[PDB]
């Protein structure tokens, strides 16, 4: 269940190439990998058809959500010699699995980030929004120390709907219960851990009607898609703070502006937005504005305009503790592959 | 009783009425008092004659009084000062004593507000919410150096366990932290949560996060200094939502740069006189240079520093308490009831 | 000569800068001068009770209701620290015996140099650079700028300010062209050609609007004329928001048809400009929220200043001294002209 | 040049520090001339020099390392030519290149208009408080205080140094309508023909509303601006420096800023730029940022009347074109065995 011991010499002969190695990937990943693998190539640019020829000679490609593997790039990784792709994340969506089947490449993945990391990020948003912390930081940096219109709100007895009670939502429910909020939950299947905290399960319509704060933790499924829309928003409680760290597909962004301007939605925290492909995990600040105009998302940039909206760039999973897990699971995954163990993260 | 008809005839003026003071306060006051004068500018000698017919002056922290303004406020006729805050410190009770002017005030903010704000600072710093917000607004959606930290199993020292420290201890335990406390007197609501009381030195040595809730006393002045900081745990997040006097600000720069203090949240800074509760951006820079605080401005420069402008008390709920305590304060004064607030 | 000194003046909308430039010179003349921080409406007009002259600004509105309360308050004169009388009615003033005076021109170098400052800031991405550097991003991408030296610049409108804009731009080294119904001989003596608007729109790298707002000029820049411009054009409007049809800006920004935009003015400034909306709760800000304006501020190649083109030591001085002379002339029964 | 183009095309070129702007201005032109061109995003090290294996010419920038040790590894990689996409050779070791057979070529001049227009840019922005204005408008503060600006038309402007760049600064500023005065050890006949008088340094400092530094950094010009000379200036003076950080003693700035002696400061440059400029430090954890933290620079950025750009005065479409075409011509001449002339050597 641990060490190698010297089967590690075999693991060490594995040659790993890692795409999209940005500063944080260097910080958490590069160090642990070179302790195990003798040869590891860290490529800063993402993975495409032009940087896939970079992988010639390597056995395994380490990838992230922003890296592309569709049918064209899988063919040149297979011809490069890499027979395993390991994701440092749990998203496999952007990889083509039908292409991997033809080319013999096996893909392994990290199914779980540490659930406290994500749950605590949702809670961070609530606190920031309640206390208008981003507003105040900026004003104070400019040298505006006046109090208007920074007046905030107490969380202590507020009613909190937790939508979806899986691993992360459970953590959200625990934390929000501990802050002292009155917590309610909705899920298709009740979580006994949540019930044992004394948080009642109610129907979704009831949860939307009674909540000061609603936090989305459910997965994105056809049944959950645009859970928040023009209709369900009119069912919520006027002034509601809506938090989403799960999936952008859970919210229909078009409906948000009217709801915000009517005061129907009083506040919005988001770690996610419905179309993030090409948008997130990119610093667009580095491109000339004429080039930024090519992929420009106007309704997103408009959304960012509101003082009661707060958006982070998909950092809810991004934590020392979560990265450590991602790293050790990616490495255990490399080893299981090379040592012929059953993978299970495939 | 219809003593409210006696109460209603009370004439009230409030200084330093900014937008937020209008919102929470003016509405509730005119429900009670028939004649109510709201002055946007603060309290001085030149705006004390604005108080010439009124019975009671409602005041704030950044306002005065001097020993002397009690007199033309007195000759204005106001024998009562009603504070919308808990500081009477900046007014002298010795000048008011001579002029028959009585001092009343709101001694308590709802302590969850203050405690929850300290928790807000901790969360914001852990997750780089201010860095993240600004980048996202510019169109930088990249991840480096937004990497945060989990709070769940971290060790948190609460320094001072009075009303606000109690809520802070309570909240941080509910979140899952390992909470320790220091105070002269253990708070039994805190001991009943199974939070151990340890020595200040032990608490500084073990804490990942230290949050100061003690009052400013000679014993606690510059509690945090060059010496005590070296007693702490490398990388510590220090939070001060109480009094600027608890920290020796000069000592922060070396400690931030060595990594000894890993992050700092502040709702208070030691010299707030003339600094806080003013929007300095409305002044030409040459006028700003006159009161410029160089070490405060340097301090804002660090990415791991987060400073709010004394907003920890500032909440719907807390403003409500203040309002209703202030209105009860006016009423008790008028009806010759005992004040209890002074 | 000591008769003028006896004048009693109230000034509405006194913010900090109004204090700095104005109150000092005024109290050198008039013995009693009342400065009210809040603007002019119905309710703060009774503050003018007894005063003979009220000095006002653009954010102050005087319709029939606020005019009646000052009139019975006693003020027979309104003096503007600005050139707009638009928000006041002159027909109500006719009925209540109150006369309208104003400062009709700011120092045109101030206004023109501001248009030039906008061009320079956008060319060199100064706002981007400032903020990044404040954050500690000292990297070079995507701060790459543009030279102004040989660029083609259209000046639309040749009056006192456009003249200065033309002069400055020629001195910078640009190839300057102009459109106006009346050629300005000062502009022609600089060897700047007057051409038709279509020709100017087709050839300009930088187009800067200096014409007044007239029925002929309204939405001068619109969906159709924009397609007549040169792809990548930098558009500057320091005159009037009505000269531009704002709705049309977004597709054109996004198509690259307009490459950059500076604005000191926007078509709907009513209730919007000269207010710091950040002192309000967001639930209150949502009431006057201008979504297309907030969207517009979103673009990296857009730069908007809050109607500061006139706001200058020199221009504030002119405004002050013309205001003091307007008051004096009224009191002395001289012909106004303002 | 047809056959010479095929011979030039056979050149193998590697470029270090290829960030977005280098891809934009450089890569396109290079791939039209050289058949094989390698663009590496990280800067040059001892470790990234091993990337140059097989390559003929390394294209480098001011931020790239050639100290005595990396020249050793580039030599053995096979590169005989180093082309700087810049005019600074300060960081390359020419004593090491001499020993290892490596020749260094360079771009000695950017368009002097680009730089001169940048200083003028700073002047306008500060005069009109454009950075303050932009930020407030973005937050939704549309109020006028303390944004009040100043007219440039009749102001007295000292230009210090009248070379290619100072000459342009003088031309532009006279054109704006300023009364321009100049100082140089040697008068520039083009400046005199603009009708701009030459005065002593003390005379210019005493009379100027605006001082703009364009002289090179010399033992005579070292800390030209210091505690003493600053008290000779005119109270409220705006100081602009786009030339060299060494011209100003940064310690002296704070007292003068706070006393009002220096009324405003625009800078494209600062005294120790090494490891500081051309890096985005926001990509690092704050704890790593604390290692090189420059307390006095960060403090300087705190002032409302100070404006700092990150060495962008040369950074222009037009200037980069000069740089690209001169660099490609530098390569071609080398390949075609022509006399170089942009060669720096020891
Ligand atoms: N850092 C980030 O922003 C990031 C990255 C990747 C994933 N995520 C999010 O984390 C989520 C996983 O959270 P988890 O750990 O708690 O997973 P989980 O499996 O443990 O919990 C999911 C729960 O949702 C419930 N559910 C199923 N259908 C539903 C419906 N129609 N309505 C409501 N609830 C329903 C399930 O019963 C289950 O209890 C992902 O789905 C994704 O949303 C976030
Ligand atoms: N919005 C703001 O930022 C704001 C405004 C006003 C006041 N405050 C701060 O909040 C404080 C009040 O908090 P509170 O309501 O809980 O008051 P409190 O009286 O209930 O708590 C004070 C506790 O500190 C203890 N104490 C006394 N001497 C001590 C020592 N040497 N060391 C350690 N502990 C000691 C006391 O026994 C007491 O239990 C104020 O003193 C002020 O510092 C903040
Ligand atoms: N600080 C500010 O931002 C601010 C404040 C108030 C007014 N303004 C603007 O400044 C302007 C005043 O500038 P000015 O001193 O140069 O005015 P001006 O009267 O002296 O010149 C206006 C010129 O526009 C010309 N013109 C008339 N119809 C035209 C048309 N259809 N097309 C093109 N040109 C036409 C006129 O012939 C005239 O020569 C105001 O009209 C206003 O737009 C700016
Ligand atoms: N993007 C940037 O910010 C950037 C990049 C590279 C270089 N630069 C600057 O541009 C400079 C080159 O400018 P240039 O093209 O005009 O070269 P230049 O030779 O034509 O200008 C320098 C002038 O200063 C004069 N001079 C010499 N000693 C002097 C003294 N003691 N005092 C005053 N003046 C003196 C020289 O005679 C010369 O005329 C570089 O030295 C550098 O400072 C800026």
Automatic annotation (TrEMBL), chain B:
UniProt domain D-isomer specific 2-hydroxyacid dehydrogenase NAD-binding: residue ranges: 119-312
Residues engaged in binding NAD(+) 1: 163-164, 183
Ranges for domain D-isomer specific 2-hydroxyacid dehydrogenase catalytic: 33-342
Gene Ontology MF term list: NAD binding; oxidoreductase activity; oxidoreductase activity, acting on the CH-OH group of donors, NAD or NADP as acceptor
Keyword check for NAD: yes
GTP-binding listed as a keyword: no
Binding site for NAD(+) 2: 163-164, 183, 219
Record family assignment: Belongs to the D-isomer specific 2-hydroxyacid dehydrogenase family.
Protein name per Swiss-Prot or TrEMBL: Putative D-lactate dehydrogenase
Naturally occurring in which organism (per UniProt): Chlamydomonas reinhardtii (Chlamydomonas smithii)
Range covered out of full length: 69 to 410 of 421
Automatic annotation (TrEMBL), chain D:
Entry keywords, A to Z: NAD, Nucleotide-binding, Oxidoreductase
Family: Belongs to the D-isomer specific 2-hydroxyacid dehydrogenase family.
The protein, known as: Putative D-lactate dehydrogenase
The UniProt record lists the keyword Oxidoreductase: yes
Residue positions binding NAD(+) 2: 164-165, 184, 220
Species whose genome carries this gene: Chlamydomonas reinhardtii
Residues of the D-isomer specific 2-hydroxyacid dehydrogenase NAD-binding domain: 120-313
Domain D-isomer specific 2-hydroxyacid dehydrogenase catalytic: 34-344
Section of the entire sequence shown: 68 to 413 of 421
Statement: the UniProt record of this protein carries the keyword NAD: yes
Binding site for NAD(+) 1: 164-165, 184
Recorded GO MF terms: NAD binding; oxidoreductase activity; oxidoreductase activity, acting on the CH-OH group of donors, NAD or NADP as acceptor
Domain of life of the organism encoding this protein: Eukaryota
């Amino acid at each position: 269940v641990e060490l190698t011991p010297q089967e590690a010499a075999k693991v060490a002969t594995t040659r790993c190439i890692c795409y999209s190695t940005t500063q944080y990937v260097k910080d958490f990943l590069a160090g642990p990998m070179q302790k195990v693998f003798t040869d590891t190539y860290f490529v800063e640019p993402p993975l495409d058809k032009d940087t896939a020829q970079l992988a010639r000679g390597y056995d395994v490609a380490v990838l992230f959500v922003n890296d592309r593997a569709d049918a064209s790039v899988i063919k040149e990784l297979a011809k490069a010699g890499v027979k395993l792709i390991a994701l440092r994340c749990a998203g496999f969506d952007r990889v083509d699995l039908h292409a991997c089947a033809e080319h013999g490449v096996r893909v392994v993945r990290v199914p779980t980030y540490s659930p406290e990391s994500v749950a605590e990020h949702a809670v961070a948003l609530i606190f920031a929004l309640n206390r208008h912390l981003t507003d105040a930081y900026i004003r104070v940096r400019m040298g505006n120390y006046s109090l208007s219109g920074l007046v905030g709100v107490e969380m202590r007895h507020k009613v909190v709907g937790v939508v979806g009670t899986g691993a992360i939502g459970q953590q959200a429910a625990r934390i929000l219960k501990g802050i002292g909020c009155k917590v309610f939950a909705y899920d298709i299947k009740p979580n006994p851990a949540v019930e044992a905290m004394g948080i009642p399960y109610v129907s979704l319509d009831e949860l939307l009607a009674m909540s000061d704060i609603v936090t989305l933790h459910c997965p994105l499924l056809p049944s959950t898609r645009q859970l928040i829309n023009k209709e369900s928003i009119q069912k919520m409680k006027k002034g509601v703070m809506l938090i989403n760290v799960s999936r952008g597909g859970l919210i229909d962004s078009a409906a948000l502006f009217d709801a915000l301007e009517s005061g129907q939605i009083g506040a919005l925290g988001l770690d996610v937005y419905e179309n993030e492909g090409g948008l997130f995990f990119v610093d667009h600040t580095k491109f000339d504005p004429s080039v930024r105009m090519q992929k420009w998302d106007r309704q997103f940039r408009t959304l960012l305009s509101y003082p009661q909206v707060l958006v982070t760039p998909h950092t809810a999973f991004l934590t020392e503790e979560a990265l450590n897990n991602i790293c050790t699971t990616t490495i255990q995954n490399i080893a299981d592959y090379v040592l012929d163990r059953p993978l299970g993260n495939e």
